[PDB]
Ligand binder design. Structure first.
Ligand SMILES: C[C@H](CCc1ccc(C(N)=O)cc1)NCC(=O)c1ccc(F)cc1
Ligand SMILES: C[C@H](CCc1ccc(C(N)=O)cc1)NCC(=O)c1ccc(F)cc1
Lengths: 726, 728
């Protein structure tokens, strides 16, 4: 009766999860990029109007992939010729459509191959980067103003990040920040002069006779890191007669003493900017609050106005120090920091007062500050029912920290335990996005009384689609190890009979601050493996795991490849001793960090896993990037942590692979975890005489996400797993 | 009751074929390495007489890879710190040991990382190439004269070949030729300045934090080729001038008009040198004969003395124009060329006479000319019993061409049908090397009457060890294709039973002038497949194959990837119909060119093959080198042969791979068939959604001959094949 969720279903995405992506343009309205045309919705009433026809740009001559409407509403930025680079970076061509005259600006147009572009926060100003230099257009048709002249491919980056700052710290390519009203344009400058280059071959189309060598400045663990500078430009004060004057904000001295990073930049007021710096030993970070000097034109960062944030048990922040959220007058701010008990909560600061006051506390953590009004502080956390894998939106009254209200917990407890949110400009409204455990639900609410205005998408189409199929169930629970409870989840085959013994696949990530046991609803590989193959797919959040306090997360500090891999093993043993698990058919697989862990596990000699698959894994921390690696491993030097660097490689575990069936996968164009990492595992396995399976994906990167590659890799892994299990 | 030849036996080399390596030092004497002490045997009787004892090189603190004794036997060159480069090239450490004073020369030592070293043919002169420049040492202990000053890594090569010339023309790294007197040192100079670079990653050992990018001047099809120059220096005048002057030998005019290659160099006499040159369009070739003008001190090459050699049906020579063998006075020579019937035979030439006279028969071919005396000419051919896969030594009367004597045919016809030979200084004696079908057999003979003097090695040892194990047999025969018979070979499992159906594996090479069906005895992977897994391992020589005349070898001219692929398929169809072959279990596998073919076969959609394995295959000719590729495909231009270059790729047949199990394998550091070729193959398979198996070998080259990689690759392919055949 009915059918199972198949591999073809997954790969051909026959069952689509409908989302509702809206972009707020005001505090009252938002744009909804429909399928054809872009409509505008009035948050309040519910009355809609078209913003621009789907046909508007037919004969444009080019295929547009994105639109960026200025905060003015007068102009529209048209982005095309999109060419992907790293995880966030890319180059493209842009055209400016005038919504007034309804024409396409044609003079002083934006350069092809533009690296980054951004409207100012209010008018119709423009800042963009081309050839690594920054340019500014006060008005769409006026000439661009060369702000910087030092740009130089792979050497100096102005307004954009280099590889490591893109991936590991800013999580963005952009490196410019407009002041609130658009007067000032702040930017960072990266210098990779002495940073070593990673080199790999890119084969490109068949037509290319000779392979090309891709070279990108990339600091591996302990190498020379790029250096950084920060600057501020007064866009209201630049002419066409003289070059723009960039005012540099330097230091702090405690930082200039050695290698450091610029980890955060947030504007406080029209004339106040906050900068957060991080030492290379990500133990210490300092936040500076600099003000603009009127009768001097410089920016002053008064000490006494700076805040120190450190950690004695590990690094600062989950992945980096948090972002402060300033109040109206920008004289105080809120930001998530670690408790005296190791739990991350919101702390209240006065820009000139050292000791902050925690406004939340408990044995749970605030995931993020979502919106700040003079009245309430809105945030998401996992406090609800003590489930670290859940997410709910809360609002705390700033006058009385005792008055905290959960805005999502009870909306529909059965179907929703994992929320995210999108607030309007002044947080007058907000879209709640429930992504599990039931089907994704998008609703719209008004902040005044926290009333539900209307459902935006309840995925009723999918619900009618799936009632047809034999869907797997999900169990989210925990086991107790040495005083602590550790969560895990299991994707269970339909008509799960605890009387039968099911093969089990351990799906791992397990990197620092990772979470794999959650209440999110998904349609993926594991769905198919459980539904069609009758395989139980489990995940476990052990030591090093995130969102449960520092005692847990910092357990692997300076000790990667130890407790997290052991807990993964220990957890499988427990599952294997549950009765419905076929102990002779347990497998393990991981992508990225999961690939590394999956590998360390297979080479651990545990005796638990028959087989395992590792996709684009790290094999030795000295091959991975500095910023990420060093944040947990310190420096690869004898004076520091060289011994563990050398003790935690997969290759040194090669002999132990003689006991398992291993599949090793990696894209040859992986700019993140270099093919080199898997190239060294394969060689160690060969030198020690271990047979195993292998698969390279030419020209694919860490995501192996091209459509065909994606279908190919999961089809291949599927065959491996069934062979190992039948 | 009884065992077999296992995978372990192959990988661990449990059963070893004994050899007998002689190194003639005179007309009646040779040296025989006893793994510990070299001895000098007297061909006449078989005397001992140690030359260098067991432990003469202890306290040397270095492992001597090889040795080379000066012609006058007064010095011995020692080679160590070996470091492989390409297929023939390598860098090494050298030291010279004075036998007269039993001392080691410590002064003026040869530099470490020397690219090549050679004693002069007489006496003890030395010439070596270091840092791409040529050096000469008149005496081992004296300072060396630098001959050239332009050597520049990856740019200018003096006395040594660039990548393409080493691989595809000279099958050697050396590019210097001593005159038979030792008076002149001739050498080539290659310029790679404008040649594109193949670039690929080398990961090295774990310790290397950042991968290395190896860059090598390597011209792919149609790309800019390296240029060449030829010079000659008189070493006996090095001690009278100051800066030695290398006399250049240019032209031939019909060559300089465009792209060309230095083809061959052979000294005729003490002051007569012969050079063969070839056009990039390899169907035209010219030999140039130059005499040393002792007056001008130059080399005058009479244009009237030039010899053209061309082909109307294909390229020239098997892989290149053949080598000339000059008579004692240099006024005449013997050279193998294909006759009007398309069969390669020997013809006699006079330096002053463009028309040559053929001295050997018809429907078979002379493999090579082995020796020349005033009396007879010795050569090897496959004329015996009309088996193109056999090899015998014959001698023909120079004064009467109808007097031809086979010297090895009947020595032991049942055990020996594949011979190679090694004559002494004046061909007064010669060693015969029987390679199959029976266990190798080495014997010494004397040329006066071709009388067998004695058996040098008969492998009686291996023989004993094998009578206890179930060894496979080898069927060598032919099938018929379009009125013409083509040979094949089959490695049959023990106690073969024609009634049972055996799975079959087609082992293919099938490149231009290839031969996979022969009378050679081998202990390889196929031995194990047959002896242990009971798999019939066959090889077929179809159109394009060699040693059977141009009609067959030139059939795929300008048409690579067509008939040769088809024939491989047609042969399997015939094998499947044979009755003792299991129709549903026929696999195919090949390495190199055979990888290309295997991949082309699997992508043909003939439905004949269940699975296949391609190791380091070519995927499209534009990716391969110019010299080898263009020789058979012409240039990749619309004016020439671009259309077939595009119609003969593996990728364009990706879709058909859906009906077969394919194992693609390749070394990441393959400087010959770049990893790129397989990288493009997998991408095309991924793009059409076909699943396959893959395996890359880190830092391994085209030979994947690393001890561990070798064991690992064969181990990997065994699992794949017996899995495809449902063994185990
Ligand atoms: C920007 C990202 C964010 C952190 C992150 C996210 C997801 C995984 C994850 N799913 O494993 C691992 C680590 N870091 C670099 C990265 O992608 C990475 C780190 C470590 C590694 F072994 C592979 C890749
Ligand atoms: C120096 C060699 C000598 C001729 C040769 C020998 C063996 C094979 C053979 N076993 O396939 C193919 C060709 N040619 C270049 C070469 O290595 C080559 C040619 C074509 C190809 F597809 C791969 C490699």
């Amino acid at each position: 009766s009915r059918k199972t969720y198949t591999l073809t279903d997954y790969l051909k995405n026959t069952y689509r999860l409908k989302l509702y992506s809206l972009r707020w343009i005001s505090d009252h309205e938002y744009l909804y990029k429909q399928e054809n045309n872009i409509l505008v919705f009035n948050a309040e009433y519910g009355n809609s109007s078209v913003f621009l026809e789907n046909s508007t740009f037919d004969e444009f001559g080019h295929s547009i992939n994105d639109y960026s409407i200025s905060p003015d509403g007068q102009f529209i930025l048209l982005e095309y010729n999109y060419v992907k680079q790293w995880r966030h970076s890319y180059t493209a061509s842009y055209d400016i459509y005038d919504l007034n005259k309804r024409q396409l600006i044609t003079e002083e147009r934006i350069p092809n191959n533009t690296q980054w572009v951004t409207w100012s926060p209010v008018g119709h100003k423009l800042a963009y980067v081309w050839n690594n230099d920054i340019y500014v257009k006060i008005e769409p048709n006026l000439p661009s103003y060369r702000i910087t002249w030092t740009g130089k491919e792979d050497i100096i980056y102005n307004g954009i990040t280099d590889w490591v700052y893109e991936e590991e710290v800013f999580s963005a390519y952009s490196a410019l920040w407009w002041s609130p009203n658009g007067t000032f344009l702040a930017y960072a400058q990266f210098n990779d002069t002495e940073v070593p280059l990673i080199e790999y071959s890119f084969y490109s189309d068949e037509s290319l006779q000779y392979p090309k060598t891709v070279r990108v400045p990339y600091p591996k663990a302990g190498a020379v890191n790029p250096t950084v500078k920060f600057f501020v430009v007064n866009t209201d004060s630049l002419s066409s007669v003289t070059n723009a004057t960039s005012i540099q904000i330097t230091a702090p001295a405690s930082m200039l003493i050695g290698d450091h990073y610029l980890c955060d930049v947030t504007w406080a007021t029209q004339e106040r900017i906050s900068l957060q710096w991080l030492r290379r030993i990500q133990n210490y970070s300092v936040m500076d609050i600099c003000d603009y000097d009127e009768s001097s034109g410089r920016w002053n960062c008064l000490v006494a106005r700076q805040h120190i944030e450190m950690s004695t048990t590990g690094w600062v922040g989950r992945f980096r120090p948090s972002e402060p959220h300033f109040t109206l007058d920008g004289n105080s701010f809120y930001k998530i920091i670690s408790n005296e008990e190791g739990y991350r909560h919101i702390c209240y600061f006065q820009i000139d007062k050292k000791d902050c006051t925690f406004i939340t506390k408990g044995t749970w953590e605030v995931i993020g500050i979502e919106a700040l009004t003079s009245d309430y502080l809105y945030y998401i956390s996992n406090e609800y029912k003590g489930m670290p894998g859940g997410r709910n939106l809360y609002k705390i009254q700033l006058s009385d920290y005792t008055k905290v209200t959960c805005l999502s917990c009870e909306l529909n407890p059965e179907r929703c335990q994992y929320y995210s949110v999108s607030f309007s400009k002044e947080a007058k409204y907000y879209q709640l996005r429930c992504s599990g455990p039931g089907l994704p639900l998008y609703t719209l609410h008004s902040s005044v009384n926290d009333k539900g205005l209307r459902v935006l998408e309840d995925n009723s189409a999918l619900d009618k689609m799936l009632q047809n199929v034999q869907m797997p169930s999900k169990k989210l629970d925990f086991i107790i190890l040495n005083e602590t409870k550790f969560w895990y989840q299991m994707i269970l085959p339909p008509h799960f009979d605890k009387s039968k013994k099911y093969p089990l696949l351990l799906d791992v990530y397990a990197g620092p601050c990772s979470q794999k046991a959650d209440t999110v609803f998904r349609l993926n590989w594991a769905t198919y493996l459980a539904s069609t193959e009758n395989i139980i797919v489990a995940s476990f959040d052990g030591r090093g795991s995130g969102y449960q306090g520092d005692k847990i997360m910092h357990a692997i500090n300076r000790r990667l490849g130890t407790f997290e891999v052991e807990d993964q093993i220990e957890a499988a043993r427990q599952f294997s001793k549950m009765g419905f698990v076929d102990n002779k058919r347990i497998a393990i697989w991981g992508w990225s960090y999961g690939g590394y862990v999956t590998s360390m596990v297979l080479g651990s000699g545990s005796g638990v896993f028959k087989c395992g698959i590792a996709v684009a894994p790290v094999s030795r921390w000295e091959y991975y990037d500095s910023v990420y690696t060093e944040r947990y491993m310190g420096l690869p030097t004898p004076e520091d942590n060289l011994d563990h660097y050398r003790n935690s490689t997969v290759m040194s575990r090669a002999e132990n692979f003689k006991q398992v069936e291993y599949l090793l996968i990696h894209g040859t164009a992986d700019d993140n975890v270099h093919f080199q990492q898997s190239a060294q595992i394969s060689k160690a396995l060969v030198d020690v005489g271990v047979d195993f399976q292998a698969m390279w994906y030419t020209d694919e990167d860490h995501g192996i996400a091209s459509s065909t590659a994606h279908q190919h890799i999961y089809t291949h892994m599927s065959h491996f797993i069934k062979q190992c299990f039948s």
